[PDB]
Amino acid sequence: NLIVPSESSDTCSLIGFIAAKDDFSLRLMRDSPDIGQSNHLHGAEAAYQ
């Protein structure tokens, strides 16, 4: 159990991290689903003016 004295906060935080080890390998490149656009970005068209 988490056990603390009266003057220590009774709710504590954990920060979790993750990483690959050196036995890792990736294949078959594809476009990432994490970014996209439905319109011209501001200033894109102005590059032609």
Known binding residues for N-acetylneuraminate are: 33-35
Least CB distance from residue 33 to other proteins, whole Å? 5
Q: Which residues are annotated as a binding site?
A: 33-35
Nearest alpha carbon to residue 13 among 2, 24, 23: 2
Least CB distance from residue 49 to other proteins, whole Å? 8
Q: Can you give the binding site for other proteins, defined by CB under 8 A?
A: 1-38, 40-44, 47-48
What does the DSSP 8-state code read for residue 39?
S
